[PDB]
Design a protein around this nucleic acid. Sequence first.
RNA 1: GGAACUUUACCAGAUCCGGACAGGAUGAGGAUUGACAGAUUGAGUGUUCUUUCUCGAUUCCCUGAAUGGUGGUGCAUGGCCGCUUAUGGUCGGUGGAGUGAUUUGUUUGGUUGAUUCCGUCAACGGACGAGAUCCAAGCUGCCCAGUAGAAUUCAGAAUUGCCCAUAGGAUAGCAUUCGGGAAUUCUUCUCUGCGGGAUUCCUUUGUAUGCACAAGGUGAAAUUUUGGGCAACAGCAGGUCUGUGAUGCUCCUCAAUGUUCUGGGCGACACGCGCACUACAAUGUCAGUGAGAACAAGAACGAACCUACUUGAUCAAAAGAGUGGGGAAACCCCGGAAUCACAUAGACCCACUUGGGACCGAGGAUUGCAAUUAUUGGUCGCGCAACGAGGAAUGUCUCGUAGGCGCAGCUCAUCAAACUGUGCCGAUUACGUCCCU
Lengths: 212, 56, 71, 99, 102
Amino acid sequence: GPLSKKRMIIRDGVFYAELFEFLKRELAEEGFSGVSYHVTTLRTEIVIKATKTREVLGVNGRRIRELTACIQQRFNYKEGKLQLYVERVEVRGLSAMAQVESLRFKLLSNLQVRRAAMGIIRYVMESGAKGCEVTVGGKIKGQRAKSMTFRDGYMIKSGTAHKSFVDSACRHCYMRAGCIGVKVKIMLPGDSTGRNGPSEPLPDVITVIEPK
Amino acid sequence: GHLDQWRSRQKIGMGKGARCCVICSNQKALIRKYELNVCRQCFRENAEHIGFTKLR
Amino acid sequence: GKIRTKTVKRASRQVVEKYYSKLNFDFYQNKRVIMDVTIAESKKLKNKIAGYTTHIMKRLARGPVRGISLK
Amino acid sequence: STYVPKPSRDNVYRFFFTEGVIACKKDRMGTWTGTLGGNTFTVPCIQVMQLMRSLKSRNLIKEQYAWRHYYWTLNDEGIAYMRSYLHLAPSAMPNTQKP
Amino acid sequence: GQTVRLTITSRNAKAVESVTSQLLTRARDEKVTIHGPVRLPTRTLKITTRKTPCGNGTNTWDTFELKIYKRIIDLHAPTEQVKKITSFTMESGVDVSITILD
RNA sequence: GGAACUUUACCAGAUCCGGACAGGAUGAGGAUUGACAGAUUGAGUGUUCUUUCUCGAUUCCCUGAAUGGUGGUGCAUGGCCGCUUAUGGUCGGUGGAGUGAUUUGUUUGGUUGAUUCCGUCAACGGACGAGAUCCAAGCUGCCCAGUAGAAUUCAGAAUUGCCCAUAGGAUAGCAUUCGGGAAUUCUUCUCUGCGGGAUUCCUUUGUAUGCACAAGGUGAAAUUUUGGGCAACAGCAGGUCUGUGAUGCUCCUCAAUGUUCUGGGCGACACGCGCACUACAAUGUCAGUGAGAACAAGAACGAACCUACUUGAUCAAAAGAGUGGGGAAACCCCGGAAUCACAUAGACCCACUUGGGACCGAGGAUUGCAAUUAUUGGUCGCGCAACGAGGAAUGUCUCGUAGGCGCAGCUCAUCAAACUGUGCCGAUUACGUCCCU
Ligand SMILES: [Mg+2]
Ligand SMILES: [Mg+2]
Ligand SMILES: [Mg+2]
Ligand SMILES: [Mg+2]
Ligand SMILES: [Mg+2]
Ligand SMILES: [Mg+2]
Ligand SMILES: [Mg+2]
Ligand SMILES: [Mg+2]
Ligand SMILES: [Mg+2]
Ligand SMILES: [Mg+2]
Ligand SMILES: [Mg+2]
Ligand SMILES: [Mg+2]
Ligand code: NA
């Protein structure tokens, strides 16, 4: 023989990374926001987080069955050992992956960079975000590439709390003149559950409790 | 006899030329530790998903 | 090199304003009170808040201080 | 060698129709194994790549690539072409389409 | 009687601790003798790569760490009882292995 | 980026199509594929040929296309990285000033590493950055051990008291030991998920309102606790098209800049420079003996991977062979590292010398498909090669630090004078200033 626990952890991580990349490429048009897999002796459970759940399912689950077949053939899962689910994202406006895909789609419609980025930011803040930051860079005005950044609300850049209070996504958007980079970072609000956000207060905030 | 000659040295499967990155099939700057077999650039791109984190 | 930043000083002023009757000149009992009556992810920040709160109490003994209003 | 023997092409097409998708590692040197009614059959990955290249150029399959692996999927016209090629019944349906 | 060992390993400390605690509670409900849990030494997997693609600039490095937590619990129970104790919804990323000792 | 082949991008040749698809020509009376033997050839390579077979509509030819490319352009781009720039920096709203560019806020005084704070104030309020957060060390609590240990009790076994060395000085005591068996008992040491613990807290001095500071105390720890990681806004035509199925536009595309295969080259020098390693010796070099680390890595019915033990051995090393163990707190392993120590009564005695180990000769073994010191160990020779402390210049560094010493990992079939970590022995000096940069 059996593989060592170190080797098992490495193998599981590599498998998750590859599955994430495959689902990100396959479901780029849909609001692919993540994947979570649970493994038991009975079978392996794979949950897909997406915005357009119907397209990921397809008609009578055709698309989901094709994805299941792809994963089964690539990783040599035996019959009945793999099952794929699709669940929608609770708040679309707080998902950086969904918003970079939305911004990319608006850009591919030959929309102006400022207009599309401002719409993304407005929708993100409308969904109750603490802040938002959209960066678009590349050949926007001519051969001389320039990088534009649009901001709103507040964002944290330093420490390691920005890895838990801010979510980020970046993609290359391909155009006729060349490559365009799109980045979105959303400062998540505070939710006590932890389903969205980190659920603990900010690391530099002290709140004094009102007495009785 | 060209079918035997074709890729006969790659048949041996020894050296830097027989191993490639499992993400990008590049044969440079491979990481063999823990049998990762990922090039260092692809590893920097994918380390968080693999499970590693930047501490210390 | 132990200056109290505005986060610590503001928190200490709020603590002294709200919980004057529960504080004294002792760092340790004030630290217990402050751990009870504040939320913070940082233990070190709470310790600094307790230190400056004890300093504020000592000053408030010798006349009023700026930024503190009590009845 | 990209010379595809006809029985190998028939087996690849039959597996492609049955299991609506085919996944194959992108290596010039290697063997692809599939299951048809039990047992197995093996065709070199170069020949699978050639067959899928021909099918892709004819607008019959959708292609995806990630981490040295291809993912080919038969679309509607590709399904019809497979049904006409193997002379299957009009009720023949891929597994991903069967409820 | 016979001893059954559960080896609980994971890369998420909270998940491994939660699963270990749940197993401890379930075993205590069954009134069986328990050895452990033993917190085995934590192993750190280190990959130190250059930060730059290509080779320009000050040679700065990234130190990526992956920590693995392992726990073991010994149950003086039959195999059926141990199988009952481990039948619950396990946290994702936690590997539980069952072994009979001699 | 430690390149034998591969890698490889270069050179000399030879193959393959990895030119999908579409429209035409031929075509089961056979489109084509692959080859025995002789010869062409570097090739007992159907590469092509002679002469014979074999497959079978997959393919060939020919036009447009297409594809691939470590081809070009980083001055067309994305992403990432380096740098400006280790410092304290940055920017709105509203208000105020100005015809305006712009300014104020954000300046000034003390303080702080800190645009850190206090104060004052045409500002008032906010946003980042700094700080906080995060990860390792040190002290510590609960948990916890049949992958860590300890102590006791029975055993069993060993020494055992007139003894003073070649003479054996100095250095505590006035019954002990045995990782080659059991039994309980326990958590001091080891393991660790979440906690506790330190904050200018306490006392004095100078500041003298505050913000603080310096000595001392308390303490495992006394000032960003220590070391890291993260790190704003603006830019640079900074690097990378040699990381990618990241890419626009351009170049080649069947005797190819695609791809393989063969052989060379990337390693050639009476040359220059940058970074190392080894030295110039006695605070040493040899031979012995002793005590003694820490991070780590180990393999894809079995088989690779890592190892211990034995053997080889009725006679060198390096080897070669068996039998086991280990998925790694379990085997390696009580991890016998090297610096180091030795009242070893050992050799050498100031010399290019038993310093140095360059260069080179002969045997032999090992990795690998392939190795003439240009794989790499090991043996005997060579050592009569410089080198006896290094000119002008110049790098790094303030405490478990410099320096010194090894070890592991990474590259890796084989090969560290490299890098990334680790522990070991362990200082001198300063605790300042703006002279230089
Ligand atoms: Mg910081
Ligand atoms: Mg070659
Ligand atoms: Mg540039
Ligand atoms: Mg660039
Ligand atoms: Mg104004
Ligand atoms: Mg203004
Ligand atoms: Mg200004
Ligand atoms: Mg340039
Ligand atoms: Mg080429
Ligand atoms: Mg000599
Ligand atoms: Mg010598
Ligand atoms: Mg090197
Ligand atoms: Na020699």
